[model samples]
Target: NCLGTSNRDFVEGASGATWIDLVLEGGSCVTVMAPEKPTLDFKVMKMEAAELATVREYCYEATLDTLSTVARCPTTGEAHNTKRSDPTFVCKRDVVDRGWGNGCGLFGKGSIDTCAKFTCKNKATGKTILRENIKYEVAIFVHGQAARFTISPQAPSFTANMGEYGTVTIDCEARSGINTEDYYVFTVKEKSWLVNRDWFHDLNLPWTSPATTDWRNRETLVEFEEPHATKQTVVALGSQEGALHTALAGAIPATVSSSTLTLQSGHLKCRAKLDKVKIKGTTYGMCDSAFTFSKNPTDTGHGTVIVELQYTGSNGPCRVPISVTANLMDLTPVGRLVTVNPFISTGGANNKVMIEVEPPFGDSYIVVGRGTTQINYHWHKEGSSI
Candidate 1:
């Protein structure tokens, strides 16, 4: 009865006409209706769902790679590595590590540019995540690596009076990064104005040899010229049995005599008596047998004389020279004496001097002299001046 009434609603009788074989007859037009048997049918529709998630996560996603291995040195061909977390790296001399970081250690001498390669990959995915090639610049400085000599106090000073007998202790230190033995030779040179002078040109400054055990530390004694004038002397220190290399110079100031003479007389000629010469606040006696004087040829009227006296006694042996000049004047006596005030006069931008005599003297004369020479003269007579 699942179909029931709805299924039979369209049903209709077959054919036209008749009824049944007539139920014959009269008997009755009575018809019996049979009950239909009920039947039920079912059909099934089927499907299967697929899984949504994959078996494993993607392999390409991974962290970038960084330098993790030691780098090779370009110079020594050795391996060196510095921690990436460290701020500074101390490199040895002559070795080079050209990897990323603050700076690669280049322990060795000289300079070089090197490259480093770092790579990383995702193992699960069989793919590369990071591959980087970086360049490292390095400069290595080597000091005191080899034996070298140096002199302290690059410039030394000596007094003029310390000629010949002057002694100075020079320290010569041999430097080598590694402990070793070294020998050095010392020499000196003299540069003085007296070299051009014929008398003392042959004199040379000398120094004592440096005595040392290993030539590591040495002390030298330098003796300057006995009668040396103001001059310069050079001392050199260098490898033994080779040419002298490094040098230091000592300077001596000009020697001055303590005794000075001032002659105030109007005489055209004068003499300066010689006495003991004082040098460096110490008085030194002069050799009586060694005194001489020379006159300057440049002066015509009044001449200048240079006096030379050799020092004697234990102080030292040196010469003292002094210069003396003569003063001369020409005085014209007028009938009356007049006091005049001399003053400088302004001549445009130049300086000039004017002399005045009182009373407007009818006849007057003025003289100007320097070093015994009368440079100019002025004459006035009868109210006229010249």
Candidate 2:
């Protein structure tokens, strides 16, 4: 994120008016420098998921086994166009597992099963829908450019138990726009954690271990009573990368009893369940390995709540190897908040301010100007009020 240039301009009539400048970098820089003011091509910022759509856009391939002759030559030879269809789509497979008891291993122990239970939904309709459930031979080109054969219905989800497991690699190159160089192979394994709301409601904010001589020896219980009026309870379970547990803490245990833990805040309460659990210590004390609970509510006055949960079961070890690769890069420039005034009137009057730009993150910036001809610049502008 480096700036390559500055944008500053001057105009007559309004000598004191200041001109704001924005630095354009890379291809954007070239586009801004054109003599005639040309419309800037702002590519809509997208994530890695868009690459998958690009792959699908190419359409799946199919093969035709039979052909028919359309015409015959008068006397010498019969002529006809040979027609056949080749498959344009391919399937891929991958397996993940999170172990029994405490699912705390790479891929965890029962992750494959949990992941298999969870269905991927169509982003557009938000419905669980797969084109077909057929077994097909699919191939994928890895980072080494090796074509690996796998069986699947395009992207086959897997279910596995403890010990070691392998995933079926379904090639989606027909649909994926990922170039060979950019095709850093990776897998997305989904897992679910159960949260207990009842236990979360009665807990203290900014969770901490009770001050006791043998804190580890005591059985810790995280209870939830009710979220204070002003707080929007958000319970974060597992790693920060894990999904957010927004469901009320009280209602979690009823559905998912064994795995969920509870935490409480102001009016907001929630539970956090780990997809996998691991028990490291024994009789002497529960020891270090445990589930971490934190609550960040909309109301800070109610304070923070954190709960320390001991590993409930001994599910053994788990391991997951995540290939580190760039997910996606954001190219859109951080838009600046600019307020334009259509009327360049000098008289003291409340002007009609328009927000011309929006910041990439957070609230929009507000720049006030009198008119297109004589504009006023506010470096650290606030929101548009008048």
Candidate 3:
């Protein structure tokens, strides 16, 4: 009731086993009724390595329906103010309480509805799991707060495949109904899964060796069956399986998670989510040594042409270089620059997408994906072609 446009109610707290999406838009409002029971693909993806930026894919299924409301402000059928690109404002019941149910409101006691129930079906299996309730404090959380798992191939001298990159970002894009979202950033450390503990202790003289490699561990298990890690605070699982044992435990050591939610900015027509790290919670951003794709070796009309990309300065957008090759197309002013997923679209006609450069006087030229458009594949990218 305090902003541009809003929905009938910002009633739900937890995304349930299911998720809640609030879309902000036009005059009247519509609720595309999504099923109450849904599934959250439950699994943890450790970066494993910076380049392994892909996540194990998951799926969800829910029935959909629709409901629209033209009902305006309380008591007075006042027309809601329609604005452009306006961020949604919060809805507090104490602000105005009449002719309405306890749908969404202040965190105050009798303000909003609270329930501890929902059903979840294992995404991997069709079996149903039930949670007759949900909470603001019950959820999974990561160890690092600003956990950002960036995938770039700037490992200067590691491997032949070190120049390849990809992204494993959970896009934090919310429009219709969004706001107050949190996320975890991560850093992946590469190492042998089998390094003996205390390798550094044998070379120590005791300043602080409470835990050392005085003795090598032959077999260590994660606390679960017994698991492990680095980051000292969360050390290698080389101690007694009991060193971290809830012994019944678990992170990337076998530990605990913390995530809670409370509060809803109510609005039936418009939705707003706090822009934390700025737009696109996690979208492709080039992060590497740096260089631009400036040329290609082949000009053959039917040959697969591979172009090399690289950036060498500390200011490179995303570097280390991604080269290209393969057949198709002909001469076009291959755009002189390349970027990390420079463009994205919600819908495309042919189950397709694209990447590019621009055009003008000195710029009237542009580069497009896959070198030329003669091919049926999407544009080649710094990561996967898609």
Candidate 4:
């Protein structure tokens, strides 16, 4: 759409295309196609379905219900398009009457239900076209800030719909690391002969898509797949957005919904060590030093560590690593306490003392040396070799 005062494009004699704003909640996006905005969000590519016969039901609000919430629409309380009853979008409708034999537009020769049956009529030729005569060039436009995406599983060189449609499987996961609420836009860019091509090449990769629901109401993460029962196998990559259809192999469809997923959580293996001393201070204290960690330092449980997953060749998600200085002293007598200062940077002070300048005594104790002499200890994500 780049030829007039407005460069917007449309397919056939259908409604003009607009950005379909979609709000995603604490759930997984079904069969993710374009995982970011380089483009993001989605467009209504209803084929009659996430299976080509499709349109993602956009979330909405009309008035105040929850005091802390308000509608996320660009204009106050308005749906992206409410005339069709609030943010409703449909594919271009050019159908002929299912009962009317090839009637182009004769006054009600028969009835054409936009929801069912179809005929691609060429207005110029005034002739009906076969579904087999259609094809589309698919482009992914990811548009959001949540930015965690991976190419699930790269089978390298996956190809679909050879003779009729050209496609590559690039399933992905639109992961929102921001645990709070977020916004997304989903609108189909209507295409025609006048449309210019953007980047239209995708490769199979080891990435991911939405989530899975269980029979027992438990939630977990998994893959989207083919088969009508699931949300995978859409006509994204080379077509439009949804799943594949032999008749219209390049049509795409996308959506929005609510659900939950398991976030990565675990405890940090907190460990401490007693470094050697320039001079051993009574070396009295034992290795009884210890520390603990949690999503909340004050909390012992019921929290997620909120980690950014990393490669495990030698690392985990915990990003805080530090060293702490601990004062070591022998407090064997619960009632009495004393400061242990058996080590010094300069063995003997610049001045002399009485005969009681006792020499250092203890194993692993340096009789004379220079250093930061407390029983200084370092803290780390203590671990075992994997």
Candidate 5:
């Protein structure tokens, strides 16, 4: 008669299934023995985000008087053996434990010379999933710290023609792990690219005529699915495996110049733009405007520009000093600025005319001389005056 809920059956006769086959398939079966064998349970728990706690610990225990069995079938190529292999248990946060069991005679009633010992201890197996249930405890450890995390959609490619929208999730949290909660989540709204593309075109047009528009002002033309961008470049998907494909189209020309103007207070203010009328590799129109220079006349000895600030006859001082600087321009998505100083000037005739600079930095320089010391009259005189 069987004492427990299940009947005792020989390992071979029970299922005609060998122990190797059972373990290979990872089945759950309990065998009966004269002395009960020890059992272990692996525990997994979840916790709040940004909270630090002991993630895992090991559990150790011993067992004895366990019945063991071994069977080998040559014809069927089946082997029933518990002595060779052991059961494994796993917990959350990538924790694992290996259990060892000892037993009696191969067939039945023989006792072991020593105690049948079974032990459970926490082992870290990394983030990958491992086997189940032997008797290890796992905890997820998280701490409160500022963090920036980005989660992008998993798709082979992005196709605007297919109306497929990619998603991105951003989170600010101390740690990222199972059971870590309480973190703020932000998702890229469905079709957010639709809005972004619109802004790009709207800002790319010239301030005048046809009120004429270029490829930069049209969405259909800008978002066309092309392998690459040409002179009239169109935005295309990026090649990075998991990157967000909505980057700018066309190359920014290398033609850029930058300059900084010093004001009366010594505060530095600067202006920069492309070297040529058109931004190379882009479909957008060129940007044109005059740059203004700021400075204190009393402190400054003179000022210089590619163009001259001529002095009139009535001025008190003959000349004043001016500092000229140059800079390199970066044509990347965002324009870059570099510093260079090639020109200098010292006191020119006191002048009333506004200073005008050309090409590169500070296209124009202007100085206003006041009463008694009127620099304006000096530049406007009937005959040369200083």
Candidate 6:
């Protein structure tokens, strides 16, 4: 008696062929036959159509439920959605979970135990479904994050002579986890008097305001001059108003001489036989002897003769004092045997001299033309003669 108003409406007009099998009480097969088809009125047909529409809507909602929650498979805990109408519920292991496992299966009535537990079931068969032996393939990608700026020779130190200039290359590099672009601003702060005003001016040559120039370049040539005052200087890539990248530049005490200068004759004698003086290693000549020693008219015959020598070199003014000794048989005078200019200015063409002669009697030539008259000359710097 499987005939009722609801049952009739449910089976009526269903597209698939339906077969009924008759069996005995003990389950022995008796007869297989098709039930008589049910006829429906136009009003009943409309009501059945409405019922089918409601079922379709419910099926669509169920599919959406599967898609929304099916992050992993139920059988093997693999992640996937069962939204499609395929007869088999494909549960791919690695496809959704990413490198988890080979596709496994789940046949019992249970839900996946993952971030999202997706139920595996058949809407038409009223049975739980699990397909554990299926694999889903998808490409995956990994990337980095954050921006970075680095410098080669991370900690840079430099040395330069005082009042001299030097240069070094600073490599600036930039990197980012994501696509990005940036620039650097170069600046300097005076730390001490070691860097003089002139040096500070030249040191700023390589400085640049933030610009879009390629930062990966290895040749960010930085130029700086050593100041007259030896001290430490700091150059930076940002602002002292805040904190940023910085490096140290040093200026040390400069040597008095970059190269050496020598005299042709360290010693000389003043006599009648004396002609052209020989002061070698640089441009040097004697000053006018007539006006140099003729300060007093009474100081006539051969007073002290001043021999001035001058030259040009890398260092500023450099001076050498000349000491003289006389071997005279006649009179003895109380005066300075070692005579030299107070100081020599080597900044430009320098002038210095050796005064070679016997002390004069302010009133007369007491020791002039004495027997075997001789004068010894020597050059010296500082207190010790060089």
- For each candidate in turn, the TM-score is 0.13, 0.13, 0.14, 0.13, 0.13, 0.13
lDDT of 3 by residue, 159-242 (tens): 111111111112112122112112111111211111111321222111111243121221121111211111101111232223
Residues 260-355 of candidate 5: C-alpha lDDT, one tens digit per residue? 110110111111111112111111111121112233322111121222334434322222222222311221211111112111122233333222
lDDT-best of 4 and 5: 5
Once fitted onto the true fold, the runs of candidate 3 whose alpha carbons sit more than 4 angstroms away are: 1-144, 147-272, 275-309, 318-386
Top TM-score model: 3
Query: Which portions of model 6 miss their true places by more than 4 Å?
Result: 1-302, 312-316, 326-340, 349-386
lDDT for 83 in candidate 5 is 40
Q: CA lDDT of 304 in candidate 5?
A: 18
Residues 1-386, candidate 2, lDDT per residue (tens digit)?
A: 11111122211123322222222111111111112222222111111111111111000111222222222212323222333122211111112222333223332212110000111111110011122322222222222032323233344332222111122111221111112221211111232222222323233222222232111211111112222212212221222122222322221111111222111111101111111222111111111222211221111111111111122223212111111111113222334322211111122222111112323323222222112322111122233211
TM-score of predicted model 5?
A: 0.13
1-386 in candidate 4: lDDT tens per residue?
A: 10011112111123422221121212111112121212222221211111111112211111111111111212122212122231121211122222223322333322111211111111100011122322221222333333222221121112232111122232222222211111111222322110001111121211111221111100111121231211112121122123211212221222222211112111111111111111111111221212122122111011111111111121111111212212233312211101111111121212111110111112111011113322211222212111
lDDT, candidate 2, equals 0.20
Candidate 3: worst-modelled 10 consecutive residues by lDDT: 226-235
Candidate 5 deviant stretches above 4 angstroms: 1-308, 313-367, 370-386
C-alpha positional error of residue 291 in candidate 2 after TM-score superposition, expressed in Å = 54
Candidate 1 TM-score, C-alpha based:
0.13
RMSD of each: 60.3, 34.5, 33.0, 31.2, 39.9, 52.6
TM-score winner between 1 and 2, please give it.
Answer: 2
Specify the poorest-scoring 10-residue window by lDDT in model 5: 18-27
Q: After superposition, how far is residue 76 of candidate 2 from its true place, in Å?
A: 71
Number of clashes recorded per candidate: 9, 61, 55, 43, 25, 19
